[PDB]
């Protein structure tokens, strides 16, 4: 909003509450039931000082408003909204909580740095959204900005896609290790990463670094024999940060028995079945 400056000097907004949000990281132990607090972001406390403080209040409250407009579309992906100033994120191994409280309510913790980095990534992603509004105002629209929640949603979901993509890559490497590494001797897996307006362009690209989609192609190095040379190359991608898409690219080099099978499965059991069909015929005798 806009406050009125009067007389030392003081700034009276619309004394006042200190709305500073925080993120805490929970962890599920061997009980496989509830979660425990494993991390929490630290909270730090004449005229320009109140300017920066109130700008942080309106900024973080605006980001919280974007999160409230985000859980309504992330409701089907586990991210449930409960309290008007408290949302929860459910994971099969962990759990997140985003609260907007003051300093009146509520160390051996370990995930204290991951929460800080997560919040800094929240504010940075919001700045990226602002740059997408300015860039989405200077060139094309020739008037006002046109945004879509689902399209401008990206804050919490792309962050969840990193952990979920890490778990999907772990289970995928487990399936590959059990169906290839535990079958053939010499084998290894190697991952490989897939005018005067230049100021804004530079900014955008650095967050090109933050804004990428987690997609990794796992090349399978099969032991090439003197009579057979099979080729197996998987590619794990995601259609929208979350979800898992396993694209199996198989190129058989066996003499008098060469065929290319490039399939796409989203179920790990189907990956075990297809890889079983590959290793039980083309790879082995």
């Amino acid at each position: 909003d806009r406050g009125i400056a009067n007389i030392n000097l003081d700034l009276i907004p619309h004394h006042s509450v200190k709305k500073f949000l925080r993120v805490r990281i929970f962890t599920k132990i061997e009980s496989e039931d509830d979660y425990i607090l494993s991390g929490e972001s630290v909270m730090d406390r004449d005229i320009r000082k109140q300017i920066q403080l109130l700008k942080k209040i309106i900024f973080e409250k605006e980001l919280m408003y974007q999160i409230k407009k985000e859980c309504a579309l992330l409701i089907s992906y586990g991210v449930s909204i409960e309290n008007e100033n408290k949302v929860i994120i459910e994971l099969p191994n962990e759990k997140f909580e985003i609260e907007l409280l003051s300093l009146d309510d509520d160390l051996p913790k370990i995930n204290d740095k991951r929460a800080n980095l997560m919040l800094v990534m929240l504010r940075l992603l919001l700045v990226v959204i602002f740059k997408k509004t300015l860039r989405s105002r200077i060139s094309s629209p020739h008037g006002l900005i046109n945004l879509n929640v689902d399209d401008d949603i990206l804050i919490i979901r792309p962050i969840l896609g990193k952990v979920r993509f890490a778990n999907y890559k772990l289970l995928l490497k487990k399936i590959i290790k059990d169906y290839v590494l535990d079958i053939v001797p010499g084998s290894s897996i190697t991952e490989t990463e897939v005018e005067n307006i230049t100021k804004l362009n530079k900014e955008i690209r650095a967050f090109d670094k933050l804004l990428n989609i987690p997609r990794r192609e796992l090349k399978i190095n099969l032991p090439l024999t003197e009579h057979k040379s099979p080729n197996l190359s998987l590619m794990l991608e995601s259609p929208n940060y979350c979800n898992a898409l396993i694209h199996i690219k198989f190129s058989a080099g066996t003499e008098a028995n060469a065929v290319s099978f490039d399939t796409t499965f989203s179920d790990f059991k189907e990956v075990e079945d297809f890889l079983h069909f590959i290793v039980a015929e083309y790879i082995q005798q």
């Binding site: 409701i75 089907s76 898992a244 099978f261 069909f277 039980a280 015929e281």
Partner: protein, 203 residues
């Protein structure tokens, strides 16, 4: 999901919801809110003595449990395991739930299966046995298609086509037919990693 109404010259106020039902009326001398249920109906008293937020918040839960109770007697499949209390959905156990603000089905980690699964709920709010059997049809056809070839032009989705001429049925068993340019020939045959060997024997 919320529509308000305020009536004058009769002294009554109405609140309507479940727009994707529950009547507030004053016809004696007190405001009452009678909430309907599937083959049932109960009453909630209204004035400060009763929070509108708590009553309207719990009614959707109590009737929501009955909505979850209809699915057990509507049309549940054998392989499709469902549990109302925290809708356990086993095709892989997937967390199913019903949206409170709308009434559609939500699954944990969606897929194409859950886009077509959710399209039936998006239309009508149980012919989903049919859609389920169609999906279970689709998967096997994807495997047999990637292994073999599949061509759709003259046959119906009730039985796949392989290409003389070949065909394979799912409801009845390998069948050998020939087509004109109208079926001309028809013979039946009974058959049994094993699927790979079977496909290698088919040729």
């Amino acid at each position: 999901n919320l529509i308000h109404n305020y009536d004058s010259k009769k002294s009554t106020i109405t609140v309507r919801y479940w727009l994707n039902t529950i009547g507030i009326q004053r016809t004696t001398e007190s405001l009452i809110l009678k909430w309907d249920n599937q083959s049932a109906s109960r009453a909630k008293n209204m004035p400060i003595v009763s929070n509108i937020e708590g009553i309207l918040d719990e009614i959707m839960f109590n009737h929501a449990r009955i909505i979850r109770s209809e699915l057990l007697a509507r049309d549940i499949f054998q392989e499709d395991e469902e549990n109302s209390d925290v809708l356990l959905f086993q095709l892989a156990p997937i967390q199913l739930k019903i949206d409170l603000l709308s009434g559609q089905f939500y699954f944990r980690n969606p897929t194409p299966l859950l886009s077509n699964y959710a399209s039936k709920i998006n239309r009508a709010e149980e012919e989903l046995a049919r859609i389920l059997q169609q999906l279970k049809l689709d998967k096997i056809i994807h495997v047999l298609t990637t292994m073999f070839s599949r061509i759709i032009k003259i046959d119906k989705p009730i039985r796949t086509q392989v290409n003389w001429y070949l065909i394979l049925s799912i409801i009845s068993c390998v069948v050998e037919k020939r087509i004109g340019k109208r079926g001309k020939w028809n013979l039946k045959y009974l058959d049994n990693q094993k699927i790979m060997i079977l496909q290698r024997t088919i040729l």
